[PDB]
């Protein structure tokens, strides 16, 4: 997989962000993570703020598509997002603000990495695992 530059337009939810990718606005859905929804579930606003803060404070945002389908039925790009080299998907799981979701159409490159982050958050009984 390879990383591509992107520019933040707007954070929408804990699991969704609007980015300028290769010249045009685009909504991205973070791969392999299920965050509480605000559109209001518990930890939903916490997950949203986390994603918002992490992307807004970064100097560089990069998107990394996996090897499976690159967009869902709603037209959102499916990717791993990096804020200053740190994967947003992983940070959410590690902080206990998201659960690892089921693999979707072959996009599983980072599933083990995320499963490990989740096991650790569970052990520490962080947020969602409270």
Contacts of 27 (CB under 8 A, 6+ apart): 12, 16, 17, 18, 19, 75, 76, 77
Structural resolution in Å: 2.1
Contacts of 91 (CB under 8 A, 6+ apart): 50, 54
Tokens read off for 8:
């933040």
Rounded Cα distance between 105 and 88, Å, is 21
Report, at the CATH architecture level, how domain 1-130 is classified: Beta Barrel (2.40)
Q: Is 86 helix (H, G, I), strand (E, B) or coil?
A: strand
Tokens read off for 2:
């390879």
Question: Which residues are marked as active site?
Answer: 29, 37, 76
The method of structure determination was X-ray
Pairing of strands 86-87, 77-83: antiparallel
Indicate left, alpha or beta for 51 from its phi (over 0: left) and psi (-120 to 50: alpha): alpha
13 marked ligand binding residue = no
Q: What is the largest CA-CA distance in the chain?
A: 42
Tokens read off for 52:
């918002």
- Residue ranges covered by each domain of the chain: 1-130
35 marked ligand binding residue = yes
84 marked ligand binding residue = no
Rounded Cα distance between 128 and 96, Å, is 6
Tokens read off for 79:
């990717």
């Amino acid at each position: 997989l390879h990383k591509e530059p992107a520019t933040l337009i707007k954070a929408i939810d804990g699991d969704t962000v609007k980015l300028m990718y290769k010249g045009q606005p685009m909504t991205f859905r973070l791969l392999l993570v299920d965050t509480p929804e605000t559109k209001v579930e518990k930890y939903g606003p916490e997950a949203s703020a986390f994603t918002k803060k992490m992307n807004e404070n970064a100097k560089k945002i990069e998107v990394e598509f996996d090897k499976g389908q690159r967009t869902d039925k709603y037209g959102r790009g499916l990717a791993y997002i990096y804020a200053d080299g740190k994967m947003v998907n992983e940070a959410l799981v590690r902080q206990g603000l998201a659960k690892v979701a089921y693999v979707y159409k072959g996009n599983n490159t980072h599933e083990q990495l995320l499963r490990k982050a989740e096991a650790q958050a569970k052990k520490e009984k962080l947020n969602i695992w409270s």
